[model samples]
Target chain A: PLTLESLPTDPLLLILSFLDYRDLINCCYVSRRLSQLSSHDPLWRRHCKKYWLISEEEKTQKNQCWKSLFIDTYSDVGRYIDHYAAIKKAWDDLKKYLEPRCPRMVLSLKEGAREEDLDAVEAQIGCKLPDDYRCSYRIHNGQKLVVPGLLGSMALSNHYRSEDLLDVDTAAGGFQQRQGLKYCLPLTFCIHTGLSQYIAVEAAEGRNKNEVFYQCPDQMARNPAAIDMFIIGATFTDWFTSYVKNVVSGGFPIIRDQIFRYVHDPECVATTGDITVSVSTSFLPELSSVHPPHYFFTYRIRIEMSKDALPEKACQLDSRYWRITNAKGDVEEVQGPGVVGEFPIISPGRVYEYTSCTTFSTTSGYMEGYYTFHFLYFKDKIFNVAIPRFHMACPTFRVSIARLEMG
Target chain B: MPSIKLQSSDGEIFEVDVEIAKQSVTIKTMLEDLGMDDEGDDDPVPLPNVNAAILKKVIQWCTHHKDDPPPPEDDENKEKRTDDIPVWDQEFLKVDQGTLFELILAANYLDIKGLLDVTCKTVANMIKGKTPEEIRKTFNIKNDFTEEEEAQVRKENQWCEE
Candidate 1:
């Protein structure tokens, strides 16, 4: 009378565990019990680290049900599924450009910008905001690109808080009042970096009024007339559509005008519980190539676990993994199976400082990822922390080689 | 070498060397927890679910594999495969299908890992390349799926298959 059902639950899963994911899925059809057991967290937990390149060499945790990790770790085709998720299903398919993991500052996803709100913004700007810009704002009114993070202007809100940005609103106004510059006019907002980055609207009439232009701050300061002004999009939505298209298309905006930035020095430090992440970003002008070389730099991250960040069974990584991105609006993932190379603790103070460098196809991008570490006291579990967004452009550089060829 | 007594479901007692009996983690724990009879009369440990016939077959497997090293505990995930059963094990496991199931059931109850592994692998070999309906037919498992339920399971797993 004994059969597979009579076997110990753990051993039954053990035998099923020997089957790879494909067969595991097939086994789900054998019976209701087999189907349910296939999702058995511990069952998949055993296979978790293997698929994710994780380990208990010092870590293990199967807390999250296996299906989550199974989907995440094996979501290769999920990338293509994005197109389907947007076009096939929901009309409010906003994830097209704004990803939560990306270094974006969006407050209310469900409520981007209301209709009356855009109309109100138009009233404040003295003319109707361009329809394309209005449509783009419907997706996310205030979005800042960390890539062209060029101006470092962190101003985004549905049409609501866009004006609450005092510095941005009064920026060109202040410039027009003092410098008597008129071109800074019709400009809606500014990064206040120099009026270097701002959105401008033109009013012709009806749909004819839908024009948005990006004014160059340096050009305005140089000759106001000579400062090159470019039309961002005949329509704001046109500009926005192109923006995300450029973002996901793997096109790292070429940042080579070292003749301008002169200094890229930028870095930020954040502390989570016991871990401290200090991210500094800058770009080295390929004074040698005249073209932006693969943006290069290291995350000189200092992770300090205040004595017992884990406070459990000899605490730490079953190994670590990372998610990386840069200002160009792109994300990459790197899996770590060991930490010996990162550090050798026991430095008395225990402030483990590790430097990891990444080489990408272009300059001007941002990178922020995480490190997953678990402890043995719990033995079969793990957790991660945001590595903090990194600077894509090498700032404050005086003289440096493009330092390429070392992939 | 110390030996212990085990009583099968049919009440037949078998004397097994301590090392070979230890191959069954269940017996090892029962003996150790009860006090490893460093020197004493051991009661016949009862395995209520395993019968004498199946128990004898399980013991033969354990006796043959008792000298083999304990299998690995956990290795980095490697691709799963059943194509590598050892030749001696291949020949030793050539019992009738019913005997094979009983061996698996008894081995599973006895907690004999090596025997459990080889037996499961053999059954898994039979399972491989078989459709779900075919597997049910092979194992005499009834097709319990109603039309609606089978259709839904098929639909849910379709993305995975494609």
Candidate 2:
């Protein structure tokens, strides 16, 4: 009799394919035989290719390996196991960031939806939900976020409402019901009002699985056949990643829209142990001719110690490397021994300032990193503190305005 | 309907109708290639590999599932749909370990895709949610790794266990 361990190699591998990424990795510890089989690269390559929905042309163009691509996407701990949990972590941080701007905004996640929930909904609508939508919904059954990563700049006219989330079968399914409108499945995460609308996916043979249309209720009813519901995203994942990228672009703990200033963004600070690093921009969208056409933006940074918050210190501050990346993700870093080319023995109560510059090929970008410092009082102990992530922009304002106008 | 005689390895003759027997692509091909589909043919198909006891159980499964639609073509990349075995099929598959193992091989060799699909999924069910150590215990597998390696895996597999 063939027991679980004694199964033939091919059959066992087939069975292992049923496991999700986390469970698949766990299978590796069962035995040397299983470890070897699980590590076989093609298995991962196929799973990535299919699940991530990466097309063959894109992979060929980028020379990407499905194995690495899939691994990188789920590289974060607990992402694949419970993606909703990971998304919630991001949402929690987002809620905290938005709290100061809109304190009473009850940002929340409804619940994590199961695969079965998706199956039932798909069956109800008779269509395959967008892959990213399915993925996001699985992570959070529904979520409400008034603070948009993109339109935060237009806070006066732009904040979203909780009714934007997909809370079907439960309470918030209160959008007006009418012919061809009752089942519009409004789940844009933050409903973009006029721009939010889509027809439920209908399961049918030989139909285009990705044929999404702008089934906006206003146009669908008023103009009926003439309402052009624009295709906002080719896929939810593609659109969401871009939106989230902007939200967390500078590694900014809080996502606050910066009002454009002549000297660029507002000053932001990050503190650690005994030292605090403050960063601000001098000239962002303004460019300097570093080369014939190449340009660099200028920045101002100040380092000091907080009064009772001195937490510790025994030695001097060793101001370290500074890196700033453009919207295109190109980075330029400078490593230094100390502030203004000197290792200053700066303690709490006073502030030191320095000037630095960078230029990008694009209109907007983000800047963040840390400084290494120490205490002269606490046995010359060394400590490192962060520089809060901030947006440096000449054109970030325009880009987000156009984005909200589309809504 | 024409009938074919299947002679088990133990020399037991099984009478299966043409339609019921053709579900096994392997036997259908053998009959077509060897021109053995004759009503009055005296020669019985010799299954020298499957013994009579296992062969009888396999025949019973096929007979019950004879009217079912052909299972879809294999989708290796899609998540495995193993939990939806029909009630009748579920009851039928509740056999001893030896019998299920023999049925898997017999079904594979006979090329009955439905049988292979359910059998592989059934095998996977044994290990689902089981720890490496638990699986080794349930299946009587020798833990060949050193204590150090085992400990390392215990930590790594803790995520799966939890």
Among the numbered candidates, top DockQ falls to 2
Question: What tens digits encode model 2's per-residue C-alpha lDDT throughout A194-257?
Answer: 3343433432211123433333223112333222233334444444443344444442223233
Interface RMSD of 2: 3.2
Residues A136-187, model 1: lDDT tens digits: 4443334332222312222211111111112222432433311212223333
In order, the candidates keep a fraction of the true contacts of 0.27, 0.42
For candidate 2, what is the lDDT?
Answer: 0.56
Q: Which candidate is the best by lDDT?
A: 2
DockQ of 1: 0.19
The CAPRI category of model 2 is incorrect
Candidate 1 lDDT, B1-162, residue by residue in tens: 778888988999999998888889888887787647454467787889988988887788788888898687854455556877889898888877667877876776777888888877887777666677776777655556778887887876665665
Worst 10 residues of 2 chain A by lDDT: A395-404
